[PDB]
Design a protein around this ligand. Sequence first.
Ligand SMILES: *C[C@H](NC(=O)OCc1ccccc1)C(=O)O
Lengths: 4, 212
Amino acid sequence: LFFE
Amino acid sequence: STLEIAGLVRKNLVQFGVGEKNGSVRWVMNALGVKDDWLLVPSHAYKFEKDYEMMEFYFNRGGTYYSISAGNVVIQSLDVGFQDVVLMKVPTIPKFRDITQHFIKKGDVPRALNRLATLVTTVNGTPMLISEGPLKMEEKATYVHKKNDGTTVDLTVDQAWRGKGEGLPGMCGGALVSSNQSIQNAILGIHVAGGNSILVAKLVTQEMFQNI
Ligand SMILES: *C[C@H](NC(=O)OCc1ccccc1)C(=O)O
């Protein structure tokens, strides 16, 4: 999971 | 309906950018006006870069731009501890339509679980509807934020929706909308992370607006  | 809630979200979504005084604007993500001059915005947009308060914040509302010193916006937490998404008062923004009554009530959270939802968002202002698989609630969700230098930090919040779906950079700050018509397709929260075909949104309830 990544900052998007 | 989902589509009519989506329209109300769409009208209140602005683009949020950051820059140095006299510098180029870096357009980062979405912010969602909720009422008066208050917006919801993921604080990971700005809080991890050096000397944020000396930067200029920019808000793009359909090609009309509003800017303000970061030191002149009032930032208010949604709850105790770190929750990423904050409330931000921007004195120079045009008044928003009050959409706070379209957010889910804390007591109705169970009614959105195990049902589809739609992420109503943009990529730099281009509106998109992103389907999310049946929702789960994670009491604690962890995701990795990549800063401007390229280095990454790990972030953790209370109460995040998790759904199967495909996100893109810049979609953060958009609103998750329940497919459940029996709770009037409530706005569930704010998109904060995506990856490995999973989408994560911070729970935002009506009760949280009591913090102004
Ligand atoms: C989307 C907004 N809805 C709203 O605030 O409704 C509150 C309501 C509606 C019907 C009965 C009781 C309360 C809006 O723009 O009005």
